[PDB]
Design a protein around this nucleic acid. Structure first.
Ligand code: FES
Ligand SMILES: [K+]
Ligand SMILES: [K+]
Ligand SMILES: [K+]
Ligand SMILES: [Mg+2]
Ligand SMILES: [Mg+2]
Ligand SMILES: [Mg+2]
Ligand SMILES: [Mg+2]
Ligand SMILES: [Mg+2]
Ligand SMILES: [Mg+2]
Ligand SMILES: [Mg+2]
Ligand SMILES: [Mg+2]
Ligand SMILES: [Mg+2]
Ligand SMILES: [Mg+2]
Ligand SMILES: [Mg+2]
Ligand SMILES: [Mg+2]
Ligand SMILES: [Mg+2]
Ligand SMILES: [Mg+2]
Ligand SMILES: [Mg+2]
Ligand SMILES: [Mg+2]
Ligand SMILES: [Mg+2]
Ligand SMILES: [Mg+2]
Lengths: 72, 97, 74, 128, 118, 23, 86, 142, 48, 137
RNA sequence: AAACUCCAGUUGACACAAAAUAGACUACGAAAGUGGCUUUAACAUAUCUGAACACACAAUAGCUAAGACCCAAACUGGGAUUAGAUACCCCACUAUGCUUAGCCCUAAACCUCAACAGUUAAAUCAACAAAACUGCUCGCCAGAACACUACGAGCCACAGCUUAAAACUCAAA
């Protein structure tokens, strides 16, 4: 899927979230999925750059209180 | 048709291929310190790739570099130069007691 | 065998038959000898698992076809 | 053979190559290169002397010229290495491959076949 | 082409070492070489004892000469170094910096079936 | 496989070499 | 002959334990292939025989490594029976 | 496959070498052609595990200094015992030291051998001082 | 670009006039080609 | 300091000493362990011969010259003649895989000498003379 | 046992011989072959197939001539074992293995798989080997044995090589 490209980058940059996946809940949303949804919203607002669309997404989540610890 | 159908593309989660410790670095016959890390301390024997972990290309470069350095007067043949015994041990071989 | 107990109960409850145990040679193709000349064989065999425990097809898949018994199978 | 002072085929058309130091001209000449570089100059000389389009390297003419340069290199090699059976084989195979090319060029374009024979000094011979 | 002369010189005092290097670099120039650089690798103990010109050597001065020369100069230079009594061992190799290293993606596995059958 | 066909040829060649030697 | 002495194949003795020093030296020479190389060099091995043995050895190692890998993989299920009675 | 045969049909079967399986086995059943192979190769694995423990100082300081060398290691088919052989030293005084430390180490070594989860189920290991020709030794004492 | 780079290097090339100066300027210097590699692929330059 | 199995390198400044003598000054016991005999020569660090003993010089002959007890006896004999000349510590250099390879070293110790190091110098040609053909037995 | 005792050990000096480890790699070359180092030259063909004989090659052994000679070694001599001789074992040593210049042209020269192109669907397929086939071309084969033979012919080959029958005989091979 197109979002798999965003997931590969998110896992490389920020790693797997210290939050644990709950695959029993069919509506579970991980930090990566929350990142992907925000990344998708900002792309639809007309932004087309990839490196810029990725940095603005992290800021939005930090504003919402999400913990994003860069791996390196 | 349908937006949720899978799309054709290359694996985005694919990991890079493994690399030997010497991948991307020039192997010179004059760099005896590097070459000495791949010979036996007691016998000077060149280690096989199963001990050095090197790839086929670098295993050959190191081997050819050692043979050149030995016969040109840069590297001993029958033992590892004792100056290089305290260098990083990059070879998967355990000897002593 | 993780589901042997569950399947035997489901068969008993619906009023049908279950065979989750080791399948002996000839239960279907040699049934008259094993059970008697008047034994009635199954009209339908349902496989909830079509493979045996060595990852080969359950022998009853072939033997059901030999005896012309229709099979349902996951 | 081209003079040793001849520049390499790669550096002959760079702007300002005639105003560089003499040392830089020696380092970009045939004198400081392997024999394969001298053969590229020979091939280019024959291509412009003979073929109509010197930049068409896939034409039957260019292949005969390229192979004729290799044949001359093998003959020079074997003049010094007379027990080299490997290169003696390559020479005889190359001569046979050129004859097959010349046969096909003679059959398709005789006017070009004649210029190739004159230009390269080949005396075409019919087989026994 | 571009060559690298790995030169092991007899352990001598500074004046005789400079005279040997000058005499060796001039031999290269007389044969048509363009000398690019001269590097001192230092005096050290040899990896083994070397006998050269009716003498035994245990130490030597290691020097490098980076230079360009015609292909015919190598054979003539190798002969010159064999006669210089102050040269313990001299070897001419193609300069390693000329050979460009090809990029490597990584280590692709080789299947076990190929190992045996091949 | 067996080598019986080779053995026949072996003996034939041996006897031939032996005949050639004698004569 | 021309090399320095008392560096190659040299083991120091600890607390007068010469048996352990000799075993360490023997282990070094074995791992480096010298002990088996000296033995094979007592008599000439004919080139066709050396290739045959070098090919047999190479294939026995590949076969033993592959059989160990299979046993390790199929030993994960050596745990007790989870569905005993069924 | 190779000249070494690998045709066994039940190749996907999960090997279960445990003491309990031997009791739940058909008495008529006899070892198959490729059934010995797993035993020959599993016994070799035990040799590999034991050899590393001896030469690594982390396992035990007393064991490391001894520098014990394993002559042979062959498990039993019963799954009740394991036979391991270490080479004896010349000095009978030194022999006593090695056996004593090895005798006490064996109990812990077993738990350390369980660290290899693939080889977790290890039958109690027997260690045999290599008195290969004790007949002369015992005869000369008397 | 290769002709330009090469034209600057020729200024530092040894010549018969500057041979003695460059020979002596080398006996005072030291060039070290030695370095070691680590299990992580990092170069460990010598302690000099 | 931790023990090093690597010998001290000459020219470096080591702290190891044996009767006030450095490693480079300890006499050397050269043991030649052949298939049919064992020869032991003790020499000083300057290559001065101090003692020689072999199974043949100790009265063993023919198939007896090549045993463990014969080499052990030769070691004791060489140790005795070497001890008289002032030798206590020796460096052992053994070449060959004969039966007296280890036994010859034991005899040197039973004779009163202390072995501080063991060196193997068994000749291994790196490619050399062609060996004789296999024995048809 | 014989042999050696200008023997053996240490140390130093010192090859026209052979090329540990790397190599658990599977590369180069038409094949034969090729695994110490350096440099030079250098690895045919922009459709494929195309020769017992044309052209050029071709392990080992061998021939001719001139050199080298550590080690190995047919042969030979001596010692031993043996009823005894030869062999197997030990010692010494030669042709030969090496170099050079010519020949000779053989191999279980075998991945025992002809070259090229294509396919993985049909029937998967006598068996075994090495999954089963298609197109196309050259070479070759037609019971066994006689027979890697005879004769003829060609060949630097002369107790040789290549090509290669028939008669008698059998019901198998
Ligand atoms: S993995 Fe890239 S050179 Fe070794
Ligand atoms: K070699
Ligand atoms: K090898
Ligand atoms: K074959
Ligand atoms: Mg016959
Ligand atoms: Mg006698
Ligand atoms: Mg063709
Ligand atoms: Mg024909
Ligand atoms: Mg042909
Ligand atoms: Mg032929
Ligand atoms: Mg030939
Ligand atoms: Mg010859
Ligand atoms: Mg000899
Ligand atoms: Mg001779
Ligand atoms: Mg040679
Ligand atoms: Mg072959
Ligand atoms: Mg063909
Ligand atoms: Mg079949
Ligand atoms: Mg017939
Ligand atoms: Mg023949
Ligand atoms: Mg004939
Ligand atoms: Mg005739």
């Amino acid at each position: 899927y197109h979002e798999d490209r965003i997931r590969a980058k998110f896992y490389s940059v920020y790693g797997s979230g210290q939050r644990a996946f709950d695959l029993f809940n069919p509506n579970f949303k991980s930090t990566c999925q929350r990142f992907v949804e925000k990344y998708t919203e900002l792309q639809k607002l007309g932004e087309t750059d990839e490196e810029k669309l990725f940095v603005e997404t992290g800021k939005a989540l930090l504003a919402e209180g999400v913990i994003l610890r860069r791996v390196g | 048709s349908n937006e949720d159908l899978p799309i054709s593309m290359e694996n985005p989660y694919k990991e890079p291929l493994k690399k030997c410790i010497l991948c991307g670095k020039h192997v010179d016959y004059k760099n005896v310190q590097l070459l000495s890390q791949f010979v036996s301390p007691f016998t000077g024997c060149i280690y096989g790739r199963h001990i050095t972990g090197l790839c086929g290309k670098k295993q050959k470069e190191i081997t050819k570099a050692i043979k050149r350095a030995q016969i040109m007067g840069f590297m001993p043949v029958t033992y590892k130069d004792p100056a290089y015994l305290k260098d990083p041990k990059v070879c998967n071989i355990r000897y002593r007691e | 065998r993780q589901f042997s107990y569950l399947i035997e109960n489901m068969a008993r409850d619906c009023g049908e038959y279950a065979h989750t145990r080791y399948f002996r040679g000839g239960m279907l193709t040699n049934a008259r000898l094993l059970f008697g000349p008047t034994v009635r064989l199954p009209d339908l065999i349902i496989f909830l698992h079509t493979l045996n425990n060595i990852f080969e097809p359950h022998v009853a898949v072939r033997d059901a076809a030999k005896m012309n018994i229709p099979t349902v199978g996951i | 053979d081209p003079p040793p002072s001849t520049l390499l085929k790669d550096y002959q058309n760079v702007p300002g190559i005639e105003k560089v130091d003499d040392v830089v001209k020696r380092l970009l000449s045939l004198e400081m290169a392997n024999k394969k570089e001298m053969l590229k100059i020979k091939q280019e000389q024959f291509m412009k002397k003979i073929v109509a389009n010197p930049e068409d390297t896939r034409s039957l003419e260019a292949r005969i010229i390229a192979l004729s340069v290799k044949i001359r290199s093998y003959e020079e090699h074997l003049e010094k290495h007379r027990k080299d059976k490997a290169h003696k084989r390559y020479l005889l195979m190359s001569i046979d491959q050129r004859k097959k090319m010349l046969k096909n060029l003679r059959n398709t374009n005789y006017d070009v076949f004649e210029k190739i024979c004159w230009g390269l000094g080949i005396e075409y011979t019919f087989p026994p | 082409p571009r060559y690298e002369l790995a030169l092991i010189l007899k352990a001598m005092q500074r004046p005789e070492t400079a005279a040997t290097l000058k005499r060796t670099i001039e031999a290269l120039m007389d044969r048509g070489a363009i000398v690019r650089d001269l590097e001192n690798l230092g005096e050290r103990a040899l990896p083994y004892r070397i006998s050269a010109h009716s003498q035994q050597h245990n130490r030597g001065g290691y020097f490098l000469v980076d230079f360009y020369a015609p292909t015919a100069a190598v054979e003539s230079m190798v002969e010159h170094l064999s006669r210089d009594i102050d040269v313990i061992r001299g070897n001419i190799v193609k300069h390693p910096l000329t050979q460009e290293l090809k990029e490597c993606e990584g280590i692709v596995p080789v299947p076990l079936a190929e190992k045996l059958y091949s | 496989k067996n080598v019986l066909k080779i053995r026949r040829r072996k003996m034939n060649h041996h006897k031939y070499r032996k005949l050639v030697k004698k004569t | 002959a021309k090399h320095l002495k008392f560096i190659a194949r040299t083991v120091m003795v600890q607390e007068g334990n010469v048996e352990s020093a000799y075993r360490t030296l023997n282990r070094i020479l074995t791992m480096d292939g010298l002990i088996e190389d000296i033995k094979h060099r007592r008599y000439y091995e004919k080139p066709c025989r050396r290739r045959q043995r070098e090919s047999y050895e190479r294939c026995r190692r590949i076969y033993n490594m592959e059989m160990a890998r299979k046993i390790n993989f199929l030993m994960r299920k050596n745990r007790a029976d989870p569905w005993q009675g069924c | 496959k190779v000249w070494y045969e690998s045709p066994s049909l039940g190749s996907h079967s999960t090997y279960k070498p445990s003491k309990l399986e031997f009791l739940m086995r058909s008495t008529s059943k006899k070892t198959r052609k490729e059934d010995h192979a797993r035993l020959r190769a599993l016994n070799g694995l035990l040799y590999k595990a034991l050899t590393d423990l001896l030469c690594t100082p982390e396992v035990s300081q007393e064991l490391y200094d001894l520098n014990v060398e394993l002559s042979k290691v062959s498990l039993t088919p019963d799954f009740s015992a394991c036979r391991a052989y270490w080479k004896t030293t010349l000095s009978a005084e030194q022999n006593a030291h090695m056996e004593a430390v090895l005798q006490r180490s064996a109990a812990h070594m077993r738990h350390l051998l369980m660290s290899q989860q693939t080889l977790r189920n290890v039958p109690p290991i027997v260690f045999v001082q290599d008195k290969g020709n004790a007949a002369l030794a015992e005869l000369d004492q008397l | 670009r290769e002709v330009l780079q090469l034209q600057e290097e020729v200024k530092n090339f040894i010549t018969r006039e500057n041979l003695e100066a460059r020979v002596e300027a080398a006996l005072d210097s030291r060039k070290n080609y030695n370095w070691a590699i680590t299990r992580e692929g990092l170069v460990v330059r010598p302690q000099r | 300091t931790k023990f090093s199995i690597y010998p001290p390198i000459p020219g470096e400044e080591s702290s190891l000493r044996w009767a006030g003598k450095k490693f480079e000054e300890i006499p050397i016991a050269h043991i030649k362990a052949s298939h049919n005999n064992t020869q032991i020569q003790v020499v000083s660090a300057s290559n001065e011969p101090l003692a020689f003993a072999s199974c043949g010089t100790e009265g063993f002959r023919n198939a007896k010259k090549g045993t463990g007890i014969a080499a052990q006896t030769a070691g004791i004999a060489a140790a005795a003649r070497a001890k008289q000349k002032g030798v206590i510590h020796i460096r052992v250099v053994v070449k060959g895989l004969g039966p007296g390879r280890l036994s010859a070293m034991h005899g040197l110790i039973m004779g009163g000498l202390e072995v501080i190091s063991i060196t193997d110098n068994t000749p291994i040609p790196h490619x050399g003379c062609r060996p004789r053909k296999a024995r048809k037995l």
